[PDB]
């Protein structure tokens, strides 16, 4: 049948900010993972609950492709059982995740001479995200006892901040494009199968 | 982005003046606009910053309680309401666009701006 | 903060056998892909073997396929490397590594978060 549109996810011209991470539902298609196997220059390509050697042999009810930009030092947070600013406040994988996480250095696309400030992350939140929770609110964060009433000041902060992607950045501060493939297996008919 | 200031001119000490700055081009809603000033023989001085979304303001100690920065999202305009003007306030007033979203509004007092206008002359007597 | 401790290293005659063991601290062992790397005198770390959560698949470096066997005992938090028909070129420090993920790029050291300090193997002619 027709191939899952991994092309539209991995090769998108524009990627989301991690706080406003993008989800594409994939279903009713053949997932030929050879487009990912034939790439040598991903910085990371790991699967959880399933061997990457089995992807072309398995069937799922749906696949979800989540995509966003973070910085180099944070790529390790896109894994089960991780904590930090991204896993806590921006994008949380469950501990029982079944799927794959791919990232690559995008410094040639996502940095610019005077700095690219287009990509944001959430710096502050009252509590940690649940797995696959998305928070796009811009409510002023109350860091103290005195309420803010939507006015910034002492202990009253805007919750989002720009990554500063300058081409002179160290690898830890360079931009990485991330795709997370979640493999959903419900008590329902499979609509995504590998070519076997 | 392109910035064009107007409203400048000659004012009595104690008086009231409103500067305008018309913004055209790709601004970020989470980011900020600022006013800075330069008197002759002196270095650039930060005056005020405002976050485009939310409208929270941050002021230099020298203008706090006297000047107010505001913006109209409809008209893509930032205002500086200059009340209780002093001799000291004489300078070229410049509008600035910051592309960077900073969590701490006070950051805009020192964070390099990306775009600035030609400016408008303000003289106090 | 999982610790890995390698053992079974030592001196062995060429043609001989050696069994390495690596024990992980904690009760997480079942959730880890386990791997062996080695660093031969004055060379970079080289991939030796890896084993998936369920014991399949197993992976081997070109140099050791047919001679080495990787296995795991989840009840003992232990991964084993059975080394047969040892050559002088197998002289190296053998490092245990673990990760929650199974990498498509299973030979890359950067795909494994957790590392032991290594066990010395010397094969004498
Ligand atoms: C993305 O485009 C490249 C061409 O630059 C192509 O080789 C690759 O297979 C595409 N990736 C996916 C996942 O379709």
Author numbering:
A (entry chain A): 333 to 528
B (entry chain F): 2 to 126
C (entry chain B): 1 to 125
Q: What does the study report here?
A:
Recognition of the RBD by the nanobodies is dominated by CDR3 and CDR2, with CDR1 only making a few contacts. As a result of binding to this epitope, the nanobody directly competes with the binding of angiotensin-converting enzyme 2 (ACE2) and thus is neutralizing.
Since the resolution of the cryo-EM maps precluded a detailed analysis of the interactions, we carried out crystal structure determination of all nanobodies bound to RBD. When the F2 nanobody was present (necessary to obtain crystals), this was bound remotely from the epitope of the H11 nanobodies. Analysis of the superposition of the RBD suggests that F2 has no systematic effect on the RBD structure in contact with the H11 nanobodies, consistent with previous observations. H11-A10 and H11-H6 are identical, but H11-B5 has a unique arrangement for R27 to F29. The change in CDR1 is a result of the mutation of Q98 in H11 to a smaller residue (G98 H11-A10, H11-H6, and S98 H11-B5), which creates a void. This void is filled by F29, which alters the structure of CDR1 but maintains the structure of CDR3. The residue at 99 is found as an aromatic in H11-A10 (F99) and H11-B5 (Y99), and Y114 adopts a different position to avoid a clash. In the H11-B5 complex, Y99 was accommodated by shifts in surrounding residues. We conclude that the additional compensating substitutions found in H11-B5 are required to allow these shifts.
